Every structure is written in C-alpha cells, then in structure tokens.
C-alpha cells in the first residue's frame with residue numbers, strides 16, 4: 001500500500017540545480033520511494049538568517065511504502081549523499097530534504113513533526129507546493145494548499 005507524501009527540497013551552496021536534480025534521482029532510487037510529481041524550481045531569498053546565499057527550492061510528490069521514520073532516514077541519507085557537512089539549522093547547506101506531508105497523518109515527536117510545522121508561513125514551500133498540490137488538505141489547518149498560499153516577491157521563478 002502506498003502513502004502519498006510531499007517533500008520540500010532546498011539548496012543554497014554550489015551548483016544548486018545539479019544538487020537538487022541529483023537528490024530527486026537518489027530519492028527515486030530508494031526501495032519504497034517513487035517520485036511521482038515535481039514542481040517548478042524557485043529562487044528564494046534566504047528566510048531567518050538572511051546573510052547567506054539565495055536558495056533554490058522545489059517540492060516533490062512521492063509514493064512510498066516506508067514508515068514516516070524510514071522516510072526521514074532516507075531524506076537525511078540523501079543530504080549526506082550530497083555532502084551536506086554544515087549542520088547549523090540556521091546556516092547554508094548543499095541540500096535540505098524536509099518532509100512536508102505524509103498522507104493526512106500528523107505526528108509531533110520531539111525531532112520529527114509532520115506536517116512540517118513551519119510550512120504554512122513559508123512562501124518558498126507553499127508556492128512550489130501549490131503548483132503540484134493545490135487541492136491537498138494540510139491536516140493541521142484543515143485548509144487546502146491553495147487556501148494557504150500567499151504572494152511573496154522574494155520567491156522568483158528560476
């Protein structure tokens with residue numbers, strides 16, 4: 001049985017587009033993950049610590065037989081494959097793979113929260129997410145993505 005999940009990908013170091021492309025390929029090659037939809041890529045001003053490089057961000061849909069914890073392990077392993085050495089959450093990274101949605105399920109473990117608890121105020125997530133998942137309901141707000149998305153001029157088509 002397959003679970004439909006959504007991942008948020010980001011990169012702000014080096015050849016960002018190549019790193020995101022390779023990440024998608026790696027994710028698709030794991031047993032138990034198939035990438036089923038890919039959003040457009042956006043160039044986005046860094047949010048939070050603003051004095052670091054501009055990001056590329058996108059979202060992907062996957063179909064998965066993995067548990068949410070196994071999925072998290074795969075996401076983290078993919079960052080390691082793309083040589084993410086920096087671990088400062090506020091700082092730059094070659095690759096970030098975030099679990100945005102895991103079916104309509106919700107979990108808030110000390111170190112795994114899904115739906116991603118910050119997604120609803122991030123245009124660098126909601127814009128590419130709305131591109132592929134406009135009618136998907138975000139379980140915490142009980143709103144469809146298209147009803148959460150908002151205009152943000154710092155998010156540009158790449």
Ligand SMILES: Nc1ncnc2c1ncn2[C@@H]1O[C@H](COP(=O)(O)CP(=O)(O)OP(=O)(O)O)[C@@H](O)[C@H]1O
Nearest residue numbers: 087088089096097098099100111112113114116118
């Ligand atoms: N939904 C989720 N997806 C990915 N990681 C999550 C997560 N919820 C919690 N985490 C935790 O976040 C830890 C740190 O990961 P980082 O990628 O450095 C944070 P970040 O992605 O810069 O911030 P963000 O998760 O607010 O976007 C992971 O090891 C994981 O335990």
Ligand SMILES: Nc1nc2[nH]c(SCC(=O)c3ccc(Br)cc3)nc2c(=O)[nH]1
Nearest residue numbers: 010044045046047048055057089090124
């Ligand atoms: N554009 C862009 N900016 C990013 N900043 C980060 S760190 C998490 C975060 O958003 C954050 C936002 C506000 C505060 Br306060 C602290 C952290 N990740 C990305 C990304 O993927 N894209």
Ligand SMILES: [Mg+2]
Nearest residue numbers: 096097098099
């Ligand atoms: Mg992350």
Ligand SMILES: [Mg+2]
Nearest residue numbers: 010096097098
């Ligand atoms: Mg992140």
